[PDB]
Amino acid sequence: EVITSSERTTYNFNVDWKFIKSNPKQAQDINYNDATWETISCPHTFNDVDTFDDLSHGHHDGEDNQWRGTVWYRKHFKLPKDDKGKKVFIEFESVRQIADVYINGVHLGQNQTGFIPFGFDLTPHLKFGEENIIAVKVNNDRGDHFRENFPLVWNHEHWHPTHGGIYRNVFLHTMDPLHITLPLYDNLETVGTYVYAENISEKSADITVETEIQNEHAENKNITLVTQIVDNDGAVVAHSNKNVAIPSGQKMKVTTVTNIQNPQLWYTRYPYMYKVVSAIKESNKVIDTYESPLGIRNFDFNKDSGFWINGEQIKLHGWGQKPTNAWAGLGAALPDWLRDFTFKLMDEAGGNFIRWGHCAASPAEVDMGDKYGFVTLMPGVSGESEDEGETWDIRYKAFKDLIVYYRNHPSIFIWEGGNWAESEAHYKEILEAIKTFDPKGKRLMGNRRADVKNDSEGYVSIEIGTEGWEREYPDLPIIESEYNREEAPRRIWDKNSPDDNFYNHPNISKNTYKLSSEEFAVRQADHWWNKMGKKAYHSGGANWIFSDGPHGGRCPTEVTRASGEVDAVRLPKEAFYALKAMWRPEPQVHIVGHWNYEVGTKKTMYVMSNCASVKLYVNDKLVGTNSNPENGYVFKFDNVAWESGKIKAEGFIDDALKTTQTKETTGEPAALKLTSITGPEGWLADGSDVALIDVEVVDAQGRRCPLAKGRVDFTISGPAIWRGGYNSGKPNSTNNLFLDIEAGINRVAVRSVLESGTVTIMAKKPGFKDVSVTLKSLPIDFNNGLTTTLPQVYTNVLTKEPLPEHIPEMPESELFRKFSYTGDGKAMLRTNMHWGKKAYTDLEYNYTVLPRYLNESEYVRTPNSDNRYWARDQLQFIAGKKMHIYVLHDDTVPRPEFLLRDYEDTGDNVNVVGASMSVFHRVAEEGESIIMAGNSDGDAPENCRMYTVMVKEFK
Ligand SMILES: [Br-]
Ligand SMILES: [Mg+2]
């Protein structure tokens, strides 16, 4: 009963391209000789070999020591002379950053979005029955300074590592001249289908589908449009038909309304997915088919009680992940199944929310949101700025392309209008774009840092919060977009374990964060509980960064911003199991760390648990019972005496045993262990599929040694391309046929080639027997440059999960408008400045002598601990009245850019216990947006003073 076959064929266009990392003249020409170019397959990036190999700069400056410029791709392919009268479209999921596409030497156009799909009609230039050639000229250049990088201001490693090339999938679509259109607004100006659900209950739901159809034949067509609703088992549950005439050359939208009896609704704990099959028929003959996703759900982001879905209230907890999503050794060009692997890990740790930061996810990643039940906050392209001119035009156009592409996915609940407040006129345009292309989705709209412009009031539909600060729009629901900025490397367990190039790292004193995995894990509850978890009005939100990546960070001991709860090769940190124990709905306990300590060790043991009480045992001797968890989920046990053997925690709800975890002391190292991980279809010989290999050091019992480290050397043979892994704490650790073990394990990637065959990887380590794994890359159905086999992903992932069995108990200035501070320390607003008042929140230093104009001013007691911290939005407020702004800045600190841009030097100084602070003066009008960043732009003296702010009404 399900309509399957038609004139439409979707080809995978990833396999077998020619590539060159340069800009040769006439590279788009039909008869350009590309024989010496490199044979690759998409997804592909030429920055896989020169990223994750530079130690972080800190100061939120991302990795810039990588190749940037103009490169070229060329692909040969032949369509059957059979298809001689078919439309042919090419679709690019994304190209980074500027793409120019050519077909047989004819330029089709450019796309500068870097992260949004686009496509072109090849038909007028195709030679059927002959070889055709696509050429893609790609540029990934960007201006050095993230504030002077126009127009593509989102294109900067500050937020988005500039990994260039065709880093997502490419498809070829062939179809009848009479066809449903493709949702690639750039540059086809078509929108495909629009699916929305109304009058939803458990009993009934009405699905409206508007199908845009185009008749590119020279004669009118009388057609029947069929809308089929297909459930999770592939059964047709309901259908609708409409008989319409499409005049020759015309586009029209055909609407159907189809009722579903007893719909399976879409929940975060049961993301039931329907599919809509749209078919064009010409009397029993099927001309075209197109499939659209369908998840049926009612929802409410409520200002008082958080988020509801289908009448159940659900706390949202998940991650903010970079769209680059890069994998060490591979860059941003993840095969879809590695994107699925990343997503399955978020799902494993209880995620039900995702924000892409700060450009759109790939298409398959929105499919993964759909099938794992992730409420999604989706941006188009953005950096961190109110934009204008051409920057706004390109970004706004990308926003339309984005809605046209993604509007039918049920995982999307909020359109992120931007990663900064915007002008009133631009808010109008944002709502007008949603009204044009998504009038019926009931999605909300917000911008992060909307609170820094009065423009946002009355336009944003949901407060997009930062770092769990107090709500600034109590009329609205609130969702957290980026909380917990901390970093910590996977390889450091705790201060009771031997150091692994961290506490003694040459760069350790430049780190903002010097946390072990245990501290990083345990504090996950501090951050979550106090910023979202304990607030019944708070919908929840996104933990900043899921996987380590070389975007801007604060720890030059690492080659990434180490803020993920898994590392850049998706090895989980203890913090991953902390969040998993807090956020999963079933009862959980997780003992933080390991059980290989020295004889006589005494340490605090942390159990993370969503249970009500936890019991702790050392070799079956009960050492404690805790019914008073800290921050909802931390059951700690002080001064536990280590004993070789076994440590076991028990989790209880209502004094009934729910779950148990045991960790064991490992024995001495005894062998290397190699374990392979491939995609669900196996390792495919397509030139880009990846096989992962876990290399471990194990004891005689086969348990991973948590303290093992040291260099392993590798050899590879067979048709494959070694891509290595990384060591977070070391430069130039990528590519090499050797790698250090960290806490007993590391992970390398092997990429296939077009030739299928047997591939052998051997690992060696002094003192161990050699070990090996044998892989087989499997042949794919490939011919004339084309395959109908789509990129492999995990299928049939639908299961039902229960609601949590236990949730921890929850508790009971006219000038500094919308003040907020995002440094690690605490700021404090205070009034009536004069001699004797404290200058900082974390010191007892007082102001003594003051220039006359400073007295009676309102002031911000800043935390001196943030004296070398940097954040774009460190300190902000809207000027409540016309006022004087004074910034006291340590003379020993290089003046930061925001100070020199908008503040003049007074000549006067204010001495505060030996430190001379120059006053900088600024007059602000009422409503002016006052944004302050780090004390210094780069390095500074370790013992310098954090700056302070003073404010007085103009009068
Ligand atoms: Br990244
Ligand atoms: Mg994180």
From Swiss-Prot:
Broad class of the protein's primary localization: periplasm
Disulphide bonds in the chain: none
Sequence positions that bind Mg(2+): 543-545, 563, 565
MF annotations from Gene Ontology: beta-glucuronidase activity; metal ion binding
Compartments, as annotated in UniProt: Periplasm
Active site: 482 (nucleophile)
Gene3D superfamilies: Galactose-binding domain-like, Glycosidases, Immunoglobulins
Keywords in alphabetical order: Glycosidase, Hydrolase, Magnesium, Metal-binding, Periplasm
Annotated GO CC locations: periplasmic space
The reaction(s) this protein catalyses: a beta-D-glucuronoside + H2O = D-glucuronate + an alcohol
Entry's induction text: By ulvan and rhamnose.
EC number, UniProt record: 3.2.1.31
GO annotation terms (biological process): carbohydrate metabolic process
A Pfam family per the record: Glyco_hydro_2
Physiological role: Beta-glucuronidase involved in ulvan degradation. Ulvan is the main polysaccharide component of the Ulvales (green seaweed) cell wall. It is composed of disaccharide building blocks comprising 3-sulfated rhamnose (Rha3S) linked to D-glucuronic acid (GlcA), L-iduronic acid (IduA), or D-xylose (Xyl). Beta-glucuronidase removes GlcA side chains present on some O2 residues of Rha3S. Can remove the GlcA side chains from polymeric ulvan or from smaller oligomers.
Family listed: Belongs to the glycosyl hydrolase 2 family.
Name the record gives this protein: Beta-glucuronidase
